[PDB]
UniProtKB/Swiss-Prot annotation, chain C:
Pfam families: HrcA. Negative regulator of class I heat shock genes (grpE-dnaK-dnaJ and groELS operons). Prevents heat-shock induction of these operons. This is Heat-inducible transcription repressor HrcA. InterPro entries: GAF-like_dom_sf (IPR029016), HrcA (IPR002571), HrcA_C (IPR021153), WH-like_DNA-bd_sf (IPR036388), WH_DNA-bd_sf (IPR036390), WHTH_transcript_rep_HrcA_IDD (IPR023120). It comes from Thermotoga maritima (strain ATCC 43589 / DSM 3109 / JCM 10099 / NBRC 100826 / MSB8). GO terms for biological process: negative regulation of DNA-templated transcription. It comes from the Bacteria. GO terms for molecular function: DNA binding. The keyword Transcription regulation applies. Transmembrane segments: none annotated.
Length: 311, 311, 323
């Protein structure tokens, strides 16, 4: 498809898509010439815009004298811009901060898959009294210090003994095994069990951030946002989006009619060469692809340098 | 005793006692003749009754012509009367039905000791939504499903998650610990407070039934019944009554002067060869001992069969 | 004024409208109720209700829809009936601050349970940092590799943050330093940059960013609930997210004790589709912050009142017992 365009027609397409991203209006033949360095009159831009429309890169919705890039046009733009170019130990906090930064800087909606807990060994349990009134509970895992919980203590229990029992019971066993009810030391221990219910608390598969951002994008409707919220529950569908490395799916390329107004950036974060989790960034397909790819990359690499440095 | 009475005199004693149980009045020598097939003069029977009285088997009430058995007499009769020979899963329901059957068929007052709650481990806690409006609470113990309670719900919640929380807190603890206020985590919310009140409902150590029967039968006084109710509060008095297998104590054999008007059958119900509780049947000493023994043995055997099948 | 019967007719219409969300006809109110009067009589009552401004007629439909006045009437009558019986709301009674000691996590649980049970959007005002004295600074070495930082406040243990350390410094002495600098000073003073000595080393700079971590003044939850509600539009929701940033406006909503503002009662036309419950949570007699629940005004008012009041009372209990 691309090969049927001379250098000029590609500059014009690039300017059409670029101006549509900035101002979210249909772009006319005149408007191109106003903001462009093209050294040709408005008459040949019109011939060029007709070939672009015939080849499926742009289109005319209603009566407007301007055109709008199709999904094919947005893909051309994405490819063309590609050619041109804090010591935290709680994994949950690290994911939270990366999720919130990603969303904020791209005005998108983010889903970060938390590390699977099924194989996650508890290396150590810690109850640290801080005063007569408070203690701090946490666990040590290969990813750092997790489930950090300040606890108010009415009675002066034997914290050292409770800690000893916790480690005897839980050290070498997995967070996943606590969830399933597999730890059946039915001997008698009130605070031990309280703590087991914290380690056994249900955590959602994904951390989400920036739903607000979708609500202030003028290109998305309530219908679109609802559809995304439903589709994101289909776990198999999120799995089918994660290609080789960092990947985008613009509009129709997503393969769901309900999600046609979105683009999705997806990829994984790593501990060494082992995939720990997937990351998704949903925006309107009318977005700054350049900025989005740059932020997405910088966040996956930060996540990967954090999780790799805990070995 | 064994060699002191002849065949006829044993017969006369047996008849005096069967007839006393029956019509509850002093039996004369002429009455012995009328209710038996003894082929001797009433004069001979009266001489036999003289011997029976001298040896302590019968006695004269006031100045009436008839005689009544002493406790020794009733015991002789009991020994002589020996020679001549649905899938419910709630243990509390099974005990209640057995207690009331036992009471009705013997016209007595029944205590059934519940399984000791100090050793009664909670194996599982269940929170079953039946509709939008109701869920069913229960626990599993080694003896089945108990504390079964329908509870009203307004708004929905993920009750499966609440259930896991109840299981971390209670699985391996005993009903007795709940009852003694030992699970302080159960005061952490209104919901858990409700659960404590359900499992820790105020319960006597004995299921009682048939108190009304003690008032039906006219050989007993108001004071006799008051004394029985006081004396039955003494845990250690009841402990002492239970001999090897099924056993009766008539009158002075009970050991307490305040209860000399009663008789008590006692024995235990088993899970396999493990004794789980004691059962007591209190009647007037003027009662149908053969009927009582037969029913008492039958219910004990049913209680033991029930509890053994819970293995 | 209204009849006893006309009061019941208005009550049924509103209850039916909240439930099924369609105009309610005379024939409907007879089917759903045990009113013992004729179909013509109900229409005459509905004419009176409309004349007094309690209900309106959408287009050409035989059915009617409550006005804001009719919604207010309904709420007042449910409030009255809620003082005859008990609560018994199993779901909301699962709320526990349990033995949690982090006020942030307690606010998190409250906002999320409240949002979930009412299908609303919740804002909880966090305690004001301006007078939040730091009572103590803890630096606890859990191993060669890890350190746990936190501060003590009058409301519990905050800013709990595990830290990597690949090289051992003297932690007992650094904790002393931190306590000299920070104890008696407020979190507001740290955020404002008054404690200039915190930038004198790399670790001290870390501590300043952890205490001075960007925390929104309000914790929000349940935005998703507003999007599932068919009675609300995209514009209603954008309008809410915009107006909710106006603190002066939020403060004007809150009255004496727990109240609801329905539709026009809110004070801004852009928010006419909503109802807001508001109230404060306290440390003893001192208000610590306000709580706001926003829903569609087509909502289960009795449920929302009950849930809101329970949670607010729980927050007051947590903050007050942490005395």
């Amino acid at each position: 498809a691309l090969k049927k365009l001379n250098d000029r027609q590609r500059k014009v397409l690039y300017c059409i898509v670029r101006e549509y991203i900035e101002n979210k209006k249909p772009v006319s033949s005149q408007r191109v010439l106003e903001v462009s360095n093209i050294e040709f009159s408005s008459a040949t831009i019109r011939n060029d815009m007709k070939k672009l429309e015939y080849l499926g890169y742009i289109y005319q919705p209603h009566t407007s004298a301007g055109r709008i890039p199709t999904d094919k046009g947005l893909r051309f733009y994405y490819e063309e811009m590609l050619k041109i170019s804090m010591p935290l130990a709680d994994p949950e906090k690290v994911l939270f901060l990366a999720g919130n930064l990603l969303a904020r800087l791209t005005e998108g909606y983010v889903l970060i898959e938390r590390p699977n807990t099924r194989d996650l060994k508890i290396l150590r349990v810690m109850l640290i009294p801080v005063s007569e009134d408070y203690l701090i509970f946490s666990i040590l895992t290969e990813f750092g210090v997790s489930k950090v919980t300040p606890i108010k203590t009415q009675e002066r229990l034997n914290w050292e003994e409770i800690e000893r029992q916790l480690n005897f019971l839980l050290r070498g066993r997995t967070v996943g095994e606590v969830l399933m009810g597999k730890i059946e030391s039915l001997k008698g221990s009130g605070f031990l069990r309280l703590i087991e219910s914290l380690i056994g608390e249900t955590v959602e598969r994904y951390l989400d951030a920036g739903l607000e951002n979708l609500l202030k994008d003028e290109t998305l409707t309530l219908e679109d946002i609802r559809n995304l919220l439903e589709e994101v529950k289909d776990q198999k569908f999120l799995e089918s989006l994660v290609g080789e490395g960092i990947t985008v799916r613009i509009g129709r390329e997503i393969g769901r009619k309900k999600l046609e107004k979105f683009a999705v950036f997806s990829g994984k974060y790593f501990k060494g060469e082992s995939p720990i989790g997937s990351v998704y960034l949903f925006t309107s397909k009318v977005t700054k692809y350049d900025r989005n790819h740059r932020v997405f990359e910088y966040i996956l690499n930060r996540l990967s340098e954090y999780f790799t440095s805990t070995s």
